[PDB]
Amino acid sequence: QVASGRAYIHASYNNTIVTITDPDGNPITWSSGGVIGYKGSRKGTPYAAQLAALDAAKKAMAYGMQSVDVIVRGTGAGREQAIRALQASGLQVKSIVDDTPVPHNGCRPKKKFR
């Protein structure tokens, strides 16, 4: 059981996934739009993400989670709402940092990304 930990948000246009880890970085539990119960396009919605971060927080609290640090990746439309859900969840939110991977003109993207 861990009091302080990490909160990772992978939120894309198609879905939002939330994983709660220990301060070492080992996941303790995770959730997503599918885990809450949605399918198809509904997974990408803000409301889906809200439920996701919660179920991610609820399970986390049950293992002794109190404090978290929120790490954000992805520019989805359900992003900020995930952040809202974690604060109003009963978790500490000691910090919130966006760490979306951006290349320095690395690999050529797919056709739809040019």
Partner: protein
């Protein structure tokens, strides 16, 4: 809030002056535009070129995470 103003006489070509240079980077690590640095056309290139040099030398970051 132009950075060029808030400093005295300083060398643009000086890649080991980490304390001067660190002021020219954004909180996210990116090199700041002229509209923020107050440098002229010619000065910007000298600045940019030496900032990159320093990054290789470990004195300056290539990127830094965005805290809220």
């Amino acid at each position: 809030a132009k950075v060029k103003a808030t400093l005295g006489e300083f060398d643009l070509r000086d890649y080991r002056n980490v304390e001067v240079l660190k002021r020219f980077l954004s909180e996210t690590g990116k090199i700041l535009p002229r509209r923020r640095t107050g440098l002229s056309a010619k000065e910007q290139r000298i600045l940019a070129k030496t900032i990159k040099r320093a990054r290789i030398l470990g004195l300056l970051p290539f990127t830094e995470k965005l805290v809220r």
